[PDB]
């Protein structure tokens, strides 16, 4: 398994191009992970619509990844949901980029809305070596 720290995740997200991606500074992305999964790469939350949210960014199996159990599957990231539970974040960042570029920005992440949107998100990467 793996549970990230905030600066460790900030660095990884920056390496893969998330700082300012589609208008969202890096702290938004770290914040989203913090409140979606508490940085736990294997976080999984099974919902009452039959979909499941997977991994550090809690990516949902209706539109974005395939778990073979979800009604209405679009698999827009063309990715097995299993890949989004990996210890390294590449597949989640790849898919997150497509999310943010093809729905409603970071509104896709309800924890981003609830705990990050409009806050001092720079705090999440403050002091991190980037």
Author numbering: 0 to 129
What did the published study say regarding this structure?
HEWL has been shown to possess two distinct folding domains: the α-domain, constituted by four α-helices, the Val120–Arg125 310-helix and the loops Gly16–Gly22 and Ser100–Ala107, and the β-domain, which comprises a triple-stranded antiparallel β-sheet, the Pro79–Leu84 310-helix and the Arg61–Ile78 loop. The flexibility of the Lys97–Gly104 loop also plays a role in the activity of native HEWL, since this region is thought to be responsible for the interaction with the first three carbo­hydrate residues (A, B and C) of the substrate. Here, biophysical data are reported for in vitro-refolded hydrogenated hen egg-white lysozyme, in combination with atomic resolution X-ray diffraction analyses, which allowed detailed comparisons with native hydrogenated and refolded perdeuterated lysozyme.
While the r.m.s.d. of D-HEWLEC from the H-HEWL structure is only 0.17 Å, H-HEWLEC shows an r.m.s.d. of 0.56 Å. The main differences between H-HEWLEC and the two other HEWL variants are observed in the Thr47–Gly49 and Lys97–Gly104 regions, both of which are at the protein surface and engage in crystal contacts. Additionally, an unusual Gly104 N(H)–Gly102 O hydrogen bond further stabilizes the Lys97–Gly104 loop of H-HEWLEC. Interestingly, the refined occupancies of both Glu7 and Lys97–Gly104 in conformation B are similar (51% and 46%, respectively). It is also interesting to note the absence of a nitrate ion in the H-HEWLEC binding cleft which is present in the other triclinic HEWL variants.
